[PDB]
C-alpha cells in the first residue's frame, strides 16, 4: 500500500546514525545492532510478522546489514574501511577486509545512490531467511516485489534506458550473493 | 551472440544425468561433466586458466546443488541425486528441498535454469559483459513469453535472490566437508 517515492522516504527516515567507537569492533557491532532492530521495525512490512519470524529474519541477516553498511560509508575512502568516523582501517580478518574493500570499490564504480542502497539493506533483511509461516513468507515476497519495482522506478527517474534498468538491477542483486558469502565466511571465524 | 543463440548454446552445453560415500562418488563423477559444461558456457574459455580454476573452485557445490534442485522439482519431499537414487546433512537436505519447493511454486522453466547455472558460475568470483548478456537472455525469454515489464522485473529479481540462498547452502555444506 505504498508508491516508489513513499518507500525510499520511509527507508531514508528509518536510516540508523553513523556511530563512533577487535574489542572496539564488537562494542561498535553491539551498538549498531540496536539501531538496526529499530531500523528493521521501521521497514515497511516488517512489524506485521510475528516475534518468532522477526527474530529469525534478523538472526539470519544481522552480519550482512553490518557489512553492507560498512561497505557503504567506506565507498568514498578507497583502500580504507570506515567502521566509525573515528575508526578508519586497512588491509581471518584480512580476507574479509579485502572482499569488503572489493565490494566498496565496486559500489563506487557503480555510483550506487543512497536511495538504491536503503533498498538493498531491506532486501538483505527480507530475503535472507504451519499457516502463519506459509502466510508470512507470502507477504515477505509481496514486500520484496514492492522494493524491486521501487528500485526500478529510482533507476527510471534517473533516466536509465529499459536495458540499463534490468542490467543494474541484476548487478546489485548479484552483489548480495557475495555479501551473504562474506557474512557466512565471517560467522565461521566468530564461532 | 544473440538471446536465442545464447539459450541454444546453453541447452546444448547441458551435462548428462549420471547413475555418504555413495553421494561423495556421484559428486566427483558430476564434477568431470561440470568442468566439461563450464568450457562450453559462452565466454568461459576466453578467461585465463587461473580464473577458470577459481570460478570452478567457488561454484562447484552451488552448480551441483542448483542442478539437484532442478532434478527434484517434480519429486516433492524427495531429492533426485540420480534416477537410481531418490531420497549436518539433515539441515542441508531441508534447505535444498525448500529451494525445489520455491522453484516449483515459481514454475522454473528450463531455458531460465540454464541461464541461472551460468550466472552461478560466472558470478561466484569481460565477465560483467557476459553476465549482462545472460541477464538480457533471461529478460528476452520473459518478454518472448509475453509477461509485462513489472512482472519481468519481479521474475528477474525473485530468481537471482534464490542465488544468495544457494551460496548459503554451499558455504554450510563446504564448512561440514
Ligand atoms: C574474520 C572475522 C575476524 C571477522 C568477523 C566480523 C567482521 N565484521 C565485518 C563487518 C563489520 C561492520 C561493522 O559496522 C562493525 C563491525 C564489523 C566486523 C568487524 C565485526 C562484526 C561483529 C563482531 C562481533 C559480534 C559479537 O560477537 O557480538 C565483530 C566484528 C570482520 C571480520
Ligand atoms: C552438510 C554436508 C555433509 C553436505 C555437503 C554436500 C552435499 N551435497 C549436496 C548436493 C549434491 C548434489 C549432487 O548432484 C551430488 C552430491 C551432492 C552432495 C550430497 C555432496 C557433494 C559433495 C560431496 C563430496 C565431494 C568430495 O569432496 O569428494 C559429497 C556430497 C550435501 C551435504
The three cell numbers of residue B27 are 559428486
Q: How far is the CA of B27 from the centre of ligand 2 (A)?
A: 6
The number of beta carbons lying within 10 Å of the beta carbon of residue A186 is 20
Q: Which residues pair with B82 in a beta bridge?
A: B85
CB distance B130 to B42 below 8 Å: yes
Q: Which residues of B touch A167 (CB under 8 A)?
A: 132, 135-136
What does this entry list as its resolution, in Å?
3.0
Residue B124 is inside which H or E element, if any? Answer: none
C-alpha B125/C-alpha A163 separation (Å) is: 24
**How far from the centroid of its chain's Cα atoms is residue B150's Cα?**
25
Instruction: List ligand 2's pocket residues with C-beta within 6 A.
Output: B 23-24, 26-28, 30, 64-65, 68, 81, 88-89, 92, 173, 176-177
Q: Are the beta carbons of A166 and B135 closer than 8 angstroms?
A: yes
Instruction: Write the DSSP string, A138-177.
Output: HHHHHHHHHHHHHHHHHHHTTT--HHHHHHHHHHHHHHHH
State how far the Cα of A84 lies from the Cα of A19, in Å rounded to an integer.
6
DSSP state of A43: S
Instruction: Evaluate whether B153 touches A148 at the Cβ level (below 8 Å).
Output: yes
Closest alpha carbon to B68 in B57, B80, B77 = B80
Query: CA A67, CA A80: separation in Å to the nearest integer?
Result: 14
Nearest to A184 among B136, B139, B171 (CB): B171
Residues in chain A: 191
Domain A1-191 CATH assignment equals 1.10.565.10: yes
- The residue whose grid cell reads 534464490 is B162
From chain B, the residues in CB contact with A162 under 8 A are 149
Closest CA to A65 of A123, A140, A111: A123
Alpha-carbon distance of B93 to B87, in angstroms, equals: 9
SS3 (DSSP) at B17: coil
Neighbouring C-beta atoms of residue A145, cutoff 10 Å? 17
**B103, B115 contact by CB (below 8 A):** no
Torsion sign, CA atoms A85, A89, A90, A95:
negative
CA distance A93 to A82: 15
CB < 8 Å to A185, chain B: 171
Describe chain B by its helix, strand, coil percentages, rounded to 5. 75, 5, 25
Cα separation values, B95 from A167, B8, B35, B91, B98, Å: 29, 31, 25, 6, 5
User: Helix or strand or coil: residue B82?
Assistant: strand
DSSP string, A45-113: TTTTS-HHHHHHHHHTTHHHHHHHHHHHHTTTSTT-EEEETTEEE---HHHHHHHHHHHHHHHHHTT--
Domain B1-177 has CATH 1.10.565.10: yes
> In this complex, do A127 and B164 lie within 8 Å of one another by their Cβ atoms?
yes
Amino acid at each position: 500500500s505504498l508508491t516508489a517515492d513513499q518507500m525510499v522516504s520511509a527507508l531514508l527516515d528509518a536510516e540508523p546514525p553513523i556511530l563512533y567507537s577487535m574489542g572496539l569492533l564488537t562494542n561498535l557491532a553491539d551498538r549498531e545492532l540496536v539501531h538496526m532492530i529499530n531500523w528493521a521495525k521501521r521497514v515497511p512490512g516488517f512489524v506485521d510478522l510475528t516475534l518468532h519470524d522477526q527474530v529469525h529474519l534478523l538472526e539470519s541477516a544481522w552480519l550482512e546489514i553490518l557489512m553492507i553498511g560498512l561497505v557503504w560509508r567506506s565507498m568514498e575512502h578507497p583502500g580504507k574501511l570506515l567502521f566509525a568516523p573515528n575508526l578508519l582501517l586497512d588491509r581471518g580478518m584480512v580476507e574479509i577486509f579485502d572482499m569488503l574493500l572489493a565490494t566498496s570499490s565496486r559500489f563506487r564504480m557503480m555510483n550506487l545512490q543512497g536511495e538504491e542502497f536503503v533498498c538493498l539493506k531491506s532486501i538483505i533483511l527480507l530475503n535472507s531467511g504451519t499457516l502463519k509461516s506459509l502466510e508470512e513468507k507470502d507477504h515477505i515476497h509481496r514486500v520484496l516485489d514492492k522494493i524491486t519495482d521501487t528500485l526500478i522506478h529510482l533507476m527510471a527517474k534517473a533516466g536509465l534506458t529499459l536495458q540499463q534498468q534490468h542490467q543494474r538491477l541484476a548487478q546489485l542483486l548479484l552483489i548480495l550473493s557475495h555479501i551473504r558469502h562474506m557474512s557466512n565466511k565471517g560467522m565461521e571465524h566468530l564461532y
